[PDB]
Amino acid sequence: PVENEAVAPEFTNRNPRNLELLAVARKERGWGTVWPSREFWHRLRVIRTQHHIEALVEHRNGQVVVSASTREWAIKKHLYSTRNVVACESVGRVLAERCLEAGINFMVYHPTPWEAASDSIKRLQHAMTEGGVVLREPRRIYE
Amino acid sequence: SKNLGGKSPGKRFGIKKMEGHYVHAGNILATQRHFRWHPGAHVGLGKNKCLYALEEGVVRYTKEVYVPNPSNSEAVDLVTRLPQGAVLYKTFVHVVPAKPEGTFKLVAML
Amino acid sequence: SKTILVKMMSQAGTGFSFNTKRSRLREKLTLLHYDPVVKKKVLFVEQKKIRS
Amino acid sequence: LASADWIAEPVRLKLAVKHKNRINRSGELILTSECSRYQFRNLADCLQKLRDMIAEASQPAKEPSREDAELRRSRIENMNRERLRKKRISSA
Amino acid sequence: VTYFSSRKGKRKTVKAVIYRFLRLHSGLWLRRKAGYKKKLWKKTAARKRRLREFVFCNKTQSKLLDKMTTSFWKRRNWYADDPYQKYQDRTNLKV
Amino acid sequence: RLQYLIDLGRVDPTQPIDLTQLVNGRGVTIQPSKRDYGVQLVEEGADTF
Amino acid sequence: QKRQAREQLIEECMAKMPQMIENWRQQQQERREKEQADKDRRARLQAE
Amino acid sequence: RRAAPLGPMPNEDIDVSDLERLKKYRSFDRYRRRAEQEARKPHWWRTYREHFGEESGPKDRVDIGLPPPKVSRTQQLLERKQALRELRANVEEERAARLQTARIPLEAVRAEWERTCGPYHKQRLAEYCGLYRDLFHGATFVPRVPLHVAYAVGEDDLMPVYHGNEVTPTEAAQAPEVTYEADEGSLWTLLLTNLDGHLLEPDAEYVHWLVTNIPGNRVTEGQETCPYLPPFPARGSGFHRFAFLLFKQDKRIDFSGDTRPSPCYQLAQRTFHTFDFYKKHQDAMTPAGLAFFQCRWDDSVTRVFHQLLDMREPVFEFVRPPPYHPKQKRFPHRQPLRYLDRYRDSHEPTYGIY
RNA sequence: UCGGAGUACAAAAAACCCUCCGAGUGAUUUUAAUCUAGACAAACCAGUCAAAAUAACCAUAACAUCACUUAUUGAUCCAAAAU
Ligand SMILES: [Mg+2]
Ligand SMILES: [Mg+2]
Ligand SMILES: [Mg+2]
Ligand SMILES: [Mg+2]
Ligand SMILES: [Mg+2]
Ligand SMILES: [Mg+2]
């Protein structure tokens, strides 16, 4: 036979993103007595410090994947008055572009009910939606 | 006499599975009356506050921090009344997964 | 104060009767239930009185 | 499939259009039944599924409606690769 | 239970066994849950499903039913369109 | 069971075969007072018949 | 005939359904508004 | 019985007495910050971090990379300060910040990101996606130089390849362009490799492209070692990762053992170990550039399998383990009638003697 | 007859004509479906949970809530309803 045709019957895929992009990876279901719910692959984390605005995309391991902060000089010479709603818009648009560059298109955002009615977080979600990142991750296959 | 109704059998509330025990999906890990063990990773919660394993694997018991639901008014009020150096700690039940999610097998060569 | 047990029949044309406790001094009851033969959200009315 | 002379030419090309995942490198369409223990029932299932494939490719009114529940991820990721696709610099 | 009858001298059976029990050919006995027709408005949906479920009988009950049942009901039966015909036999029993 | 009876010569295919010659070849036993109505063909040996 | 009568009753009662739903919802809404307006009128009369 | 704790209690630092004098936080967000700060410390009791795969915890990362650029901190700080003062000096900036209508040039933001912290961000994406784990194991590098890969679909359509992107093989059927800024004083090596997709060996990787001794920016004028090959994932197992690595080499090095022929379609010949290959020439090459993309199966994979490599195309399937069942009991007690259906082999009536 | 606390101090169980609280239901709408892995508990009868899978609705939308929530309840047969 042809030498090249030899193949293992079981294929080993060492990429950790394969199961997540195929949506058959294990989410960490449970908890419920604590908050936020840890059932996600990627989570949007918005820290609104009295000076700066810092957004993160976190995996369930606790590692940070991509972050957009106003502590960065690259944004910092481009915006004015680091605290604003406009600063939150800059953070949201920059992180949406970085998520498109990093290939992550789905995440779970779990805001506090007083942060949900805020002006900056609502239009930051608007900038994330217009940026092309769809929140509220798809359901697991055979969950 | 004066005191009546003191006869009632136990509800058998307690701990069922220990650390190191191998469980499958759906096994009740513990049952409880008030919140004594909290559910952690891969451990579900039934409406009678029982803890049941969501995935097949090994049970672990762990101490971590308590960050309650903001919709729970008494809990968030207890958070508000804590001093600045204090953090809440509670115990949790987890199931580390043993089996992988799946495997890739060659079904047909075309 | 006493309650009454009332039988509720479907308005989707299919026969389905389910029993509900309702307070005696209240009026005739009308709810929105689920019919497992129509698989739709069906308006139900109070039809008969069974148990006190 | 190319020498299957009991079907018309548009049906023959449409079976290659839709069912190319079942086509062997030598042009062989391969169909497989597993369900029943009885191979007579397996062959009857094979001919029933073959009639299902032929009828579909033979009907010009088939619009091929696709379910969205398994394709929302594909549509969103298709639009999202089309976002980075949009830059226009001539090459090669 | 009449172990020796006065007319025929045979072993009789109790019809209260037959009127509510079903015997499979593996020795297993099938029965209904108690109270499935009583107070449906008061019980939950999961409890209603649990009472609507068929259940099996264990060893001591199954031997009691076999002792109170004559040998007519332990025969092999081939009914037309029997739903329990698929459940008559036992398979993959490694004991 | 039918192919076993025919291959062992309990019943023959040269003569038309019915429940009478099946009972005569002892392939099936019918108890009418147990309210059997006859013999049903079942498809266990359809591949090797 | 029984099956066709059942199907005709099902389709006849399903052709009248959303208008019945909206009429019952509107009736309950005006009941709530009437109770709330009666309480507001009683409060406005008792405040003076 | 009481035992002694092995280390400090969490709440033993604050004083129990005189609770009114101790300052309180009144914010659930302040508790969220404090608890997420507390959860990251290595406590002496059993933790979630110990049990749920922290990937060996603290790891001594061996750095195999270019030196970081030496930029004067005081001069950098003063020029940033003066730029900020001239930015707050304007009144129209105040107007645009107040009236919720202001836009930023995201292209210039991307350029300054690529110059400033893009290396560290691409390093943490490579650490997250496990590029270092399956190529250099514990060794890691900072992707110092900017690197741009682009695929020419047609006349004007040009599909970029950034870190962690997703490119269909129809876009990647042809050879890409590679852009990076360098003067003519150094030598470069570009290597596109498929980390997952080897059929026989799970620990090995494929070469999809390799060019060596690149004079500066000009990739085409460099000597061609291994031909470009289109991406071929499996139909079942999707999302293979393809990585472009750029190495800076000082001397001009020629390979007699790593040279691949002109058509070179044999996957036995196309078998790579990047660890051993960097072990062979550690003294010359230092990795400086990296860009990797995910890639799934499409219809264009079939022609690469059949016409180019002369293959019957393998098709895989994601098969879950069978569901667990207990040991079957002879007399089940309080169990449904469907309990026999769990242990029934096939749903076909079998007659042993009838 | 059923539940809560101590007796029974730390998994479960554990009695007395032992000491104290109760329960034989109210209020509101969020009117709370079908199917099926695996379990707790138990002499039996009973009782409890329940992931996945369908349908309903944000178009990838299943815990009725509160009153210490735990108890708020009754087996066959037989009667009336009639699906
Ligand atoms: Mg007691
Ligand atoms: Mg007792
Ligand atoms: Mg017989
Ligand atoms: Mg500085
Ligand atoms: Mg037990
Ligand atoms: Mg479910």
Helical segments of chain D, H only: 9-18, 39-58, 72-85
C-alpha H329/C-alpha A54 separation (Å) is 59
- Residue H98 beta carbon within 7 A of nucleic strand I: no
The owner of tokens 């009857």 is D44
- DSSP secondary structure letter of residue F32: G
Find where tokens 């075309």 sit: B110
Q: Å from B33 to nearest chain D CA?
A: 41
CA pair distance B99, B94, nearest whole angstrom: 15
Nearest nucleotide by C1' position to the H333 CA atom: I44
Q: Are the C-beta atoms of H206 and H272 separated by less than 8 Å?
A: yes
Q: Residue E44: what residue type?
A: T
| DSSP strand pairing (H314-319 vs B103-109) | antiparallel
Question: Vertex H24, ends H22 and H30: CA angle to 5°?
Answer: 145
Residue F46 contacts H, CB cutoff 8 Å: no
Angle, helices H118-129/H106-116, rounded to nearest 10 degrees: 80
DSSP A46-70: EEE-SS-EEEEEEETTS-EEEEEET
Q: Provide the resolution (angstroms).
A: 3.5
Which are the contacts of F44, defined by CB distance < 8 A and separation ≥ 6? H350, H351
Cα C19 from Cα H191, distance rounded (Å): 74
Rounded to 5°, the CA angle D80-D81-D82 comes to 85
Contact H297, H235 (CB under 8 A): yes
Do the beta carbons of residue H316 and residue H236 sit within 8 Å? Answer: yes
Residue H197 contacts residue A8 (beta carbons within 8 Å): no
Query: What structural domains does chain C harbor?
Result: 1-48 (2.20.28.120)
Q: How would you classify the pairing of strands C30-35 and C40-51?
A: antiparallel
- Mention every residue, 6+ apart, whose C-beta is less than 8 A from residue D84: A100, A101, H159, H160, H162, H165
Domain that holds residue B6: 1-110
Encoded tokens for H60: 């001594």
SS3 label, residue C49:
strand
Q: Is the CB of E15 under 7 A from strand I?
A: no
| Alpha carbon of C1: minimum distance to chain E alpha carbons (Å) | 19
Q: Which domain holds residue A122?
A: 1-143
Run of H or E including D6: none
Amino acid at B53: A
Please tell me whether any atom of strand I lies within 7 Å of the Cβ of C52: no
**Regarding beta strands B89-97 and B38-39, do their DSSP bridges make them parallel or antiparallel, or are they unpaired?**
parallel
Contact state of H177 with D91 under an 8 Å Cβ cutoff: yes
- Rounded to a whole number of angstroms, the CA Rg of chain H reads 29
Any idea which residue has 């609502």 for tokens?
A122
Structure obtained using: cryo-EM
Q: At what angle do helices D72-85 and A85-102 cross, to 10 degrees?
A: 100
Give the integer Cα–Cα distance in Å for H207 and H193: 4
- Does residue C15 approach strand I to less than 7 Å at its CB? yes
Supply the CATH number for residue B57's domain: 2.40.50.100
**How many independent structural domains does chain A possess?**
1
Q: Pick from E2, E80, A79, A18: which is nearest to H102 by CA? A: A79
Residue B104 CB coordination number (10 Å) = 20
Q: Which chain I positions have some atom within 7 A of a protein CB?
A: 1-6, 8, 10-23, 25-28, 31-53, 55-57, 60-65, 70, 73-77, 83
Ligand that lies nearest to the alpha carbon of residue B5, given by its number in the listed order: 1
Contact status, residue H231 vs residue H171, Cβ threshold 8 Å = no
Q: Distance between CA H252 and CA H188 in Å, rounded?
A: 10
Q: Among candidates H156, H116, H143, H134, which has minimal Cα distance to H241?
A: H134
CB-based contact G10 C14, cutoff 8 Å: yes
Going from the Cα of B98 to the center of ligand 1, the distance in angstroms, rounded, reads 41
Residue showing tokens 């393998």: H314
Q: Give G33 CA → I74 C1' in Å.
A: 45
Please give the biggest Cα pair distance in chain C: 37
CATH number of the domain that A132 lies in?
3.30.420.80
Distance of alpha carbon B107 from alpha carbon A10, whole angstroms:
10
Chain H interface includes E87 (CB < 8 A): yes
Q: Which two tokens stand for residue D52?
A: 């299902």
Return the residues preceding each gap in chain H, C–N over 2.5 A, or none.
none
Spatial separation of the C-alpha atoms in residues H194 and H240, rounded to whole Å: 7
| Residue A26 host element (H or E) | none
Classify residue H197 as left (phi > 0), alpha (psi -120 to 50) or beta: left
Q: Residue B60 in contact with residue B83, Cβ under 8 Å?
A: no
SS3 annotation, chain H: CCCCCCCCCCCCCCCCCCCCCCCECCCHHHHHHHHHHHCCCCCCCCCHHHHCCCCCCCCCCCECCCCCCCCCHHHHHHHHHHHHHHHHCCCHHHHHHHCCCCCCCHHHHHHHHHHHCHHHHHHHHHHHHCHHHHHCCCCECCCCCCCEEEEECCCCEEEEECCCEECCCCCCCCCCEEECCCCCCCEEEEEEEECCCCCCCCCCEEEEEEEEEEECCCCCCCEEEECCCCCCCCCCCCCEEEEEEEEEECCCCCCCCCCCCCCCCCCCCCCECHHHHHHHCCCCEEEEEEEEEEECCCCHHHHHHHHHCCCCCEEEEEECCCCCCCCCCCCCCCCCCCHHHHHCCCCCCCCCCC
DSSP string, E54-95: EEE--HHHHHHHHHHS-TTTTS----TT-GGGSSSS--S---
Calculate the alpha carbon distances from G1 to C10, C15, C47, G6, G13 in Å: 22, 17, 27, 9, 18
The residues with which H240 forms a beta bridge, in sequence order, are H295
Cβ of E48 near strand I (under 7 Å)? The reply is yes
Rg of chain G over CA atoms, in angstroms?
Answer: 21
Domain count, chain B: 1
Which residues precede gaps in chain C, with C-N > 2.5 A?
none
Q: Which of residues 43-72 of B touch strand I (CB under 7 A)?
A: 44, 46-50, 52, 54
Alpha helices in chain F (DSSP H): 2-7, 19-24
Token pair in block for residue B30: 């513990």
Q: Is the Cβ–Cβ distance between B98 and B21 less than 8 Å?
A: no
From A72, A29, A13, select the one nearest H129 (Cα to Cα).
Answer: A13
What's the CA angle centered on A72, arms A69 and A73, to 5 degrees? 150
Query: Do residues H316 and E40 lie in contact, with contact meaning Cβ atoms separated by under 8 Å?
Result: no
Task: Give yes or no for H348 touching F (CB within 8 A).
Answer: no
